[PDB]
Amino acid sequence: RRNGFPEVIYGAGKTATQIVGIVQALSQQTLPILTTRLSAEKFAALQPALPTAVYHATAQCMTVGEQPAPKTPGYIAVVTAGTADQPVAEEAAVTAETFGNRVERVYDVGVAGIHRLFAKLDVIRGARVVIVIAGMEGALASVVGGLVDKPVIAVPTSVGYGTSFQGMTALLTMLNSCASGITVVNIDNGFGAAYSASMVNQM
Amino acid sequence: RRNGFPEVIYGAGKTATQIVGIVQALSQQLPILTTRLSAEKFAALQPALPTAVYHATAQCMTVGEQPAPKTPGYIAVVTAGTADQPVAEEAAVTAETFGNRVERVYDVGVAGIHRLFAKLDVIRGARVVIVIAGMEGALASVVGGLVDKPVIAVPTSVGYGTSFQGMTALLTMLNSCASGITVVNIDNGFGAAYSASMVNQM
Amino acid sequence: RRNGFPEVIYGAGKTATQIVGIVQALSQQTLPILTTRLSAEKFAALQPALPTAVYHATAQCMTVGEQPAPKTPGYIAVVTAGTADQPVAEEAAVTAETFGNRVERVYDVGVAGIHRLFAKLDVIRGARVVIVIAGMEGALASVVGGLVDKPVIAVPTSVGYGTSFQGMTALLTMLNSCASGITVVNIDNGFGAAYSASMVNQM
Amino acid sequence: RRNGFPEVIYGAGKTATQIVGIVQALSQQLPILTTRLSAEKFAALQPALPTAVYHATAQCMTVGEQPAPKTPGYIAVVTAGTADQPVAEEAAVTAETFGNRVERVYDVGVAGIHRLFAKLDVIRGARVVIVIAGMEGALASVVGGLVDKPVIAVPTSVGYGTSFQGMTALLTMLNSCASGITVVNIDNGFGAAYSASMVNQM
Amino acid sequence: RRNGFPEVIYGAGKTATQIVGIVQALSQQTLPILTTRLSAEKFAALQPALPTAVYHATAQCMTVGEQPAPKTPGYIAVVTAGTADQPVAEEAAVTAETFGNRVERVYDVGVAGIHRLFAKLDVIRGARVVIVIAGMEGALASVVGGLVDKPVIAVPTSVGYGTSFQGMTALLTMLNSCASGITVVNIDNGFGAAYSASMVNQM
Amino acid sequence: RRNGFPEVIYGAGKTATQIVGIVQALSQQLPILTTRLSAEKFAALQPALPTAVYHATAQCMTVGEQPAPKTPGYIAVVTAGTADQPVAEEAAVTAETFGNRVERVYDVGVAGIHRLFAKLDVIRGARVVIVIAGMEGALASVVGGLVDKPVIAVPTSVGYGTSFQGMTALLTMLNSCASGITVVNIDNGFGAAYSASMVNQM
Amino acid sequence: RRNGFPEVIYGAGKTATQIVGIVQALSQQLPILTTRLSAEKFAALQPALPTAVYHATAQCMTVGEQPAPKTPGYIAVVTAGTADQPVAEEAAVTAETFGNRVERVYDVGVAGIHRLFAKLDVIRGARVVIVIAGMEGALASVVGGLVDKPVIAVPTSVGYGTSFQGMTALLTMLNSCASGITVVNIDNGFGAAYSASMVNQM
Amino acid sequence: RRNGFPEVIYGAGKTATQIVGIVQALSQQTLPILTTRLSAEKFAALQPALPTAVYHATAQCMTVGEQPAPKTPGYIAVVTAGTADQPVAEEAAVTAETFGNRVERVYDVGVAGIHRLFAKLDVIRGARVVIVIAGMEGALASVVGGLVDKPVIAVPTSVGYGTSFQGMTALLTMLNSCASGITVVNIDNGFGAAYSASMVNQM
Numbered sequence A, C, E, H: 001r002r003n004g005f006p007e008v009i010y011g012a013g014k015t016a017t018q019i020v021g022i023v024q025a026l027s028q029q030t031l032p033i034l035t036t037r038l039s040a041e042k043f044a045a046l047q048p049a050l051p052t053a054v055y056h057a058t059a060q061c062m063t064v065g066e067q068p069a070p071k072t073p074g075y076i077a078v079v080t081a082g083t084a085d086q087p088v089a090e091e092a093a094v095t096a097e098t099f100g101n102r103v104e105r106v107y108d109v110g111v112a113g114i115h116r117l118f119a120k121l122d123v124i125r126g127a128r129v130v131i132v133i134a135g136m137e138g139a140l141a142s143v144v145g146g147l148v149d150k151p152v153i154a155v156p157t158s159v160g161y162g163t164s165f166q167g168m169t170a171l172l173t174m175l176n177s178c179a180s181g182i183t184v185v186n187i188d189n190g191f192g193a194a195y196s197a198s199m200v201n202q203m
Numbered sequence B, D, F, G: 001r002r003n004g005f006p007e008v009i010y011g012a013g014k015t016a017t018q019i020v021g022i023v024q025a026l027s028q029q030l031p032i033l034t035t036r037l038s039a040e041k042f043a044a045l046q047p048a049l050p051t052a053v054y055h056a057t058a059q060c061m062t063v064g065e066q067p068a069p070k071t072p073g074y075i076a077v078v079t080a081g082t083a084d085q086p087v088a089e090e091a092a093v094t095a096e097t098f099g100n101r102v103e104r105v106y107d108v109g110v111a112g113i114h115r116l117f118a119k120l121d122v123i124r125g126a127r128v129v130i131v132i133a134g135m136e137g138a139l140a141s142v143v144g145g146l147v148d149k150p151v152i153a154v155p156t157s158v159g160y161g162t163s164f165q166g167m168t169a170l171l172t173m174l175n176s177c178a179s180g181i182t183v184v185n186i187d188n189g190f191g192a193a194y195s196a197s198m199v200n201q202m
């Protein structure tokens, strides 16, 4: 509309054919098209029909449309606790970049080896908004929130077994931090966090 | 320091004397905000800090005349019902103590949604919107879909039965984050205003 | 019996062969036969044995028997929040039509774009009973309940990931509305809601 | 207005003075029903509204002589045990204040199911049945399978331990909706009568 | 031992080859051998090695050893609410018969059509112990418990979708009955209920 | 009637006067047992029933001299700790009022399991064993594996934190039913003795 | 006996007289430690044991002058906030009564993590570390990753809302056990010091 | 580092190719390499690339590096309640042995037949640390804790059906014991318990 936000397809409840119909209908509008939670088998069914589509395997995201050059004099930090958080981390990063934001990835800096976090603390503190992504104990959000004076958006992930409860423990831990200045989204919702981060970053 | 934020005392686990001790030590540190301060604890505290202002509904205490706002924008504090007013006023008083303009849009739940559209101009003009609701957390979803500004949802613990002291409102809000919505802990109006302040003042 | 209600088969705990035996035994009685939660592979095993059966792919329902012409001077509105709710939405609509009710589908009017709801508010308010079907935040039920002065039956769906909890959050949200005038059924139970709606509509 | 429904005050989060203020403002709006009103709050309210009727068991207050019923049919209020009577009487008083005939079928739980069949003629003759039960929510399932009329099940919070303040009764009732059963929130006898009234008066 | 109870194999955590080793080792002892939760594919791997084994498809149980003639002047009633409860119902019935008990099956008498229950109430009341098996609302246990003056053992089943929660709701309902004289076992544990019923029946 | 069981009043939701009314109506019905009767409610009740016996720990009241036991066997009431004694004594007093011999084997939890083996002869000689435990429900599993008699496990609500007012003890006991174990609701010593009585007297 | 451990009374479910009775019976059994002893129960107990020491914050009571420590190493008792001090002091007093040196590292939560690194030399020098925290249980994860010594995490029940009386802190700590972390029940500072004592004294 | 602890790979969130890259990079460092939760199909993809790797099928663990000779004058007891606990039991035992500890396995001594436990009580009491591993009712931890005056670490397993709740009941039971002297780890985390046991054993 009057806002520059791209169209977003939730490719989970839609089939690969439904998506091609939704994409082809909105390919005559404007902006770019972002599709989240799009399986690798679904993009195979998409590659002939949408030959201009770019698939980001790790993020399970698909973008059709030239990525916008960065539009704001700042960057968003996407901070991850472990490599298992990378899929939802890349979902947020691809979302933030599709929305026109510079993204600095600070991956695999969980508190199990907290020295890695302080080595990249200069990068995290320089961002305008920090997205912290973690599963299991999700303790990294609390540590980051107490160390940066910038808006932090915490993303709980469903990574882990046992008492991780498909992300519920990470969610409860991060909500109990809220070390102030932390705000939380639903489990695995890297897109939603990047949506909010983009609005904060683009002020 | 170095960030511009006033000092914050979490006066729940502290006695009326401990709070007076923290204030006198901080008489070189802006204004002082004290959250979650009961009236019975403020009565014992009123003879000690004669310049202190108590916000009964917010259960908050301010120690020092606030200067002008730091930023010309405003934060919108939106509530679904009058029962949400305590944590709303906690968020509103926190945001104002941090130097933010606050416009209160109270009691506009979706049971009578016409009240919400009447105040939609005020909400959309805000730089950040804090939506506060209990029981059904539906107000966050409606606001999030109607404003293209950051929304921070605060679930309240109002209600019995299946409201589960805010647990249902919290889960409802978390499932609306695909909009511009982000969520804080139950009743944490302070935390919401803390993040809202940072977004508004950048 | 003395009531016009059709026979209903719960084709979930029965195999495609058991269903043909249950159908063939009741095909000498009266009324129509409705079978819910009937997989697409199960209807394939049914098509030779029951050549008069009609399968509604989206609803996962099977009807054997001429659909009754509408029997009451009113219609039931089946209102859905998103396209992912369509399977259980069609389960309710096929049930309500099998019971002899006119059905007006008002699909994909979730509160993410609430303007779509008011565009079809005339249709919803004209119904005698409204079935509201939604997953995730299930907030649409509360919004509809406050806007219509007719009995509303809310159906929580198991659509969604994370903290949706296979419909539990939608269920709790709708139960906490009950904006008065809302009544709730079990997760994904579009049939049960249409059963109650039919009784209200047929008074 | 425009719907025929009396005004409803949720007198739980309001003080005895606030309720009297809402009534005097509404002295142009039918009868006035006030739900969830404690006796300690009604005592302070009794000198203010001398024409008011208090239903002790229902914790409800009515402000105005009810006219005749609007419809010749009746709503059946069915309870499994005497402990369910408060929320039952809340539902019964609400339904009568909305202009519905109410036949009470109380204390007919399945522990002694012979009581249920003795009153089955009254239940089946109803236009709508509200079934109210706690602990095991089994009465809803039995009634739902025995009547071909809309059933609205109300779980109550009676009991300790694994009753979980109505959570088990609620889950039991939700899993009986394949019958003619539909469910409301725990203890929400008002909401059940509200929907029952609409079904009965169409 | 000094008690006549047969050996019981929990064929869930054991593979079809492990079971043949456990069976062959105890086939030189005494009594019969009962194996519960034994998949249909596992009995295929068992049929060559154990050619004297009998598989009860519905119960997912396997018995090696001549079934004992009834040993007590009474019978146990195994009462079921719906056909979906039949697998765990047959698990209890095969267990009770392997332990030397007469079993009277009263199947598919749920409260949705309660008239079926009273038609077989004479049979249920004549038993020395009643095993009530039900899922979803598990309300049948409460109804049976109030109608019979005999020990009742309630078995919650994991049948159902939505808010049935894989048997948790049935379990909570039955525990809240305990209409006195009802006692409860773990979800789907028809064996454990028949174990206790056998001890009560054999006094 | 027709079953030999004494009349049972659930005196929790009833007042001291209501209970006296039920007793006088039942003065043609065996002994009368009243469960879950507080001492403050029994004090108001003591002048009314001067022949009544109160069991303080069990919170139970008996109205009539019990005849001899009906059956020579005995029910074993086994507890893991002294905190379980109230619901244990409720089960013991219920079983004795129903005409069963009761042997109490109290405070034999697995923290000091040597106490359990010292009293194993008494437990194994029982016709039915009621095992009562809170926190870790481990005593049921140990007893169930050691006796070839019906075991009825009663979880108690003793403890805070992750005991969850008996929820953990309940889940532990339910997962031991592969032994000779069957389970009742939290704190339901009455229900356990009710079933135990039926097994013992057949 | 035979293990060197002092006798431990769980004084929560016992009255001030019962505890004095257990002590007089134990006057041949080391020092006597009594945990979870309220001040109102200790006031009635103070005239009875005039040699007894009460630790108000720990709600613990010691009966006998402790000899020297048994082992030259020390146990570190680490807390995230001042609200954790009661269960921390319960753990500290228990560990000292069992003959262990205790170094308290209090109020070093990750909200201000600089306090933690300032005291890291003391924590790393410990033979066993007990980490005690509520709300977010993040302090256990940070400590577990920073020390190569056994860590025993104690969740506390501080907080409302989604802290769930320690349930969230407990789940957070359990998901950090891949470090050197092991977990005890909510608020169980005694149990943590009990295991810590065994590790420290081997 | 200065500590002798081996490198540990969490082979759950990594693919068989990622693991070969992580292993080959750390095969030029020191100590042994332990990889937990490594599927049997993943080791097949590993056997050509890592020909010196040893796979322990039951433990789902992989070790590359000569196992260290025992380094402390004591042994750790790994005590199990049932055969279904053996996978996580062997995960702990392989971890403890990779860390340089003698391990005494006391398997299948659940309280259903408690006499088996006392027969091996001499072995359990002689250990410096006891790891108790149990699912379902996890009652064995409480029984062991009251019988030994040594540090006990309880591991809840996700074995079982119904109300076992994938290990939650065992976890809650063991936490409620903490019979003092018991300490608890997350569900199925035999590695984490052996990590702590190794530190206690190596003092």
Ligand SMILES: Nc1ncnc2c1ncn2[C@@H]1O[C@H](COP(=O)(O)OP(=O)(O)OC[C@H]2O[C@@H]([n+]3cccc(C(=O)O)c3)[C@H](O)[C@@H]2O)[C@@H](O)[C@H]1O
Pocket (backbone or CB within 6 Å): A081, A082, A083, A084, A085, A108, A109, A110, A111, A112, A133, A134, A135, A136, A137, A138, A139, A140, A141, A157, A159, A160, G178, H008, H009, H010, H011, H013, H036, H037, H189, H191, H192
């Ligand atoms: N069997 C086992 N179960 C659980 N953890 C085990 C393990 N064996 C080793 N580990 C250890 O777990 C660690 C992570 O495994 P890795 O291979 O690197 O995998 P990684 O991606 O780094 O971690 C997986 C999950 O743990 C979460 N995490 C870890 C640490 C801290 C935080 C935080 O909240 O700050 C979050 C993280 O968000 C992610 O979702 C490793 O150091 C490894 O030694």
Ligand SMILES: Nc1ncnc2c1ncn2[C@@H]1O[C@H](COP(=O)(O)OP(=O)(O)OC[C@H]2O[C@@H]([n+]3cccc(C(=O)O)c3)[C@H](O)[C@@H]2O)[C@@H](O)[C@H]1O
Pocket (backbone or CB within 6 Å): A008, A009, A010, A011, A013, A036, A037, A189, A191, A192, B178, C081, C082, C083, C084, C085, C108, C109, C110, C111, C112, C133, C134, C135, C136, C137, C138, C139, C140, C141, C157, C159, C160
């Ligand atoms: N990664 C992501 N995770 C969650 N949501 C994401 C998303 N990316 C975009 N979205 C957004 O979610 C929205 C829905 O996705 P779509 O493609 O249209 O799919 P849709 O069928 O419309 O929604 C799926 C579920 O969301 C429920 N819902 C949505 C909105 C409001 C309400 C209500 O309670 O009123 C309920 C609805 O009941 C349904 O069960 C889209 O606007 C999309 O932009």
Ligand SMILES: Nc1ncnc2c1ncn2[C@@H]1O[C@H](COP(=O)(O)OP(=O)(O)OC[C@H]2O[C@@H]([n+]3cccc(C(=O)O)c3)[C@H](O)[C@@H]2O)[C@@H](O)[C@H]1O
Pocket (backbone or CB within 6 Å): C008, C009, C010, C011, C013, C036, C037, C189, C191, C192, D178, E081, E082, E083, E084, E085, E108, E109, E110, E111, E112, E133, E134, E135, E136, E137, E138, E139, E140, E141, E157, E159, E160
């Ligand atoms: N979409 C749907 N979802 C849920 N139920 C639906 C349905 N469509 C019809 N139904 C109705 O559900 C009923 C059962 O289905 P059916 O084909 O016969 O299958 P059935 O085996 O009889 O029942 C399946 C489960 O419901 C449980 N149940 C049912 C009724 C009472 C009780 C009790 O606790 O007494 C328990 C029973 O224990 C079993 O585990 C049918 O009458 C059918 O009309």
Ligand SMILES: Nc1ncnc2c1ncn2[C@@H]1O[C@H](COP(=O)(O)OP(=O)(O)OC[C@H]2O[C@@H]([n+]3cccc(C(=O)O)c3)[C@H](O)[C@@H]2O)[C@@H](O)[C@H]1O
Pocket (backbone or CB within 6 Å): E008, E009, E010, E011, E013, E036, E037, E189, E191, E192, F178, H081, H082, H083, H084, H085, H108, H109, H110, H111, H112, H133, H134, H135, H136, H137, H138, H139, H140, H141, H157, H159, H160
């Ligand atoms: N249908 C059934 N459902 C559940 N249990 C059934 C059963 N049929 C027999 N059983 C019995 O369950 C027992 C175990 O089965 P098995 O073949 O040996 O298999 P097993 O590995 O020994 O036990 C499986 C699970 O039960 C747990 N368990 C069992 C006993 C005690 C404890 C404890 O906490 O001390 C824990 C154990 O940790 C393990 O995770 C057998 O004696 C068998 O007779």
Ligand SMILES: [Mg+2]
Pocket (backbone or CB within 6 Å): A081, A082, A083, A084, A108
């Ligand atoms: Mg990693």
Ligand SMILES: [Mg+2]
Pocket (backbone or CB within 6 Å): A145, A146, A147, A148, A149, A150, A179, A180, A181, A182
């Ligand atoms: Mg911050």
Ligand SMILES: [Mg+2]
Pocket (backbone or CB within 6 Å): B080, B081, B082, B107
């Ligand atoms: Mg309002």
Ligand SMILES: [Mg+2]
Pocket (backbone or CB within 6 Å): B143, B144, B145, B146, B147, B148, B149, B151, B179, B180, B181
């Ligand atoms: Mg928005």
Ligand SMILES: [Mg+2]
Pocket (backbone or CB within 6 Å): C081, C082, C083, C084, C108
């Ligand atoms: Mg849609």
Ligand SMILES: [Mg+2]
Pocket (backbone or CB within 6 Å): C145, C146, C147, C148, C149, C150, C179, C180, C181, C182
């Ligand atoms: Mg309405």
Ligand SMILES: [Mg+2]
Pocket (backbone or CB within 6 Å): D080, D081, D082, D107
């Ligand atoms: Mg009654």
Ligand SMILES: [Mg+2]
Pocket (backbone or CB within 6 Å): D143, D144, D145, D146, D147, D148, D149, D151, D179, D180, D181
């Ligand atoms: Mg019906």
Ligand SMILES: [Mg+2]
Pocket (backbone or CB within 6 Å): E081, E082, E083, E084, E108
């Ligand atoms: Mg059936």
Ligand SMILES: [Mg+2]
Pocket (backbone or CB within 6 Å): E145, E146, E147, E148, E149, E150, E179, E180, E181, E182
């Ligand atoms: Mg009975």
Ligand SMILES: [Mg+2]
Pocket (backbone or CB within 6 Å): F080, F081, F082, F107
């Ligand atoms: Mg004791």
Ligand SMILES: [Mg+2]
Pocket (backbone or CB within 6 Å): F143, F144, F145, F146, F147, F148, F149, F151, F179, F180, F181
């Ligand atoms: Mg047994």
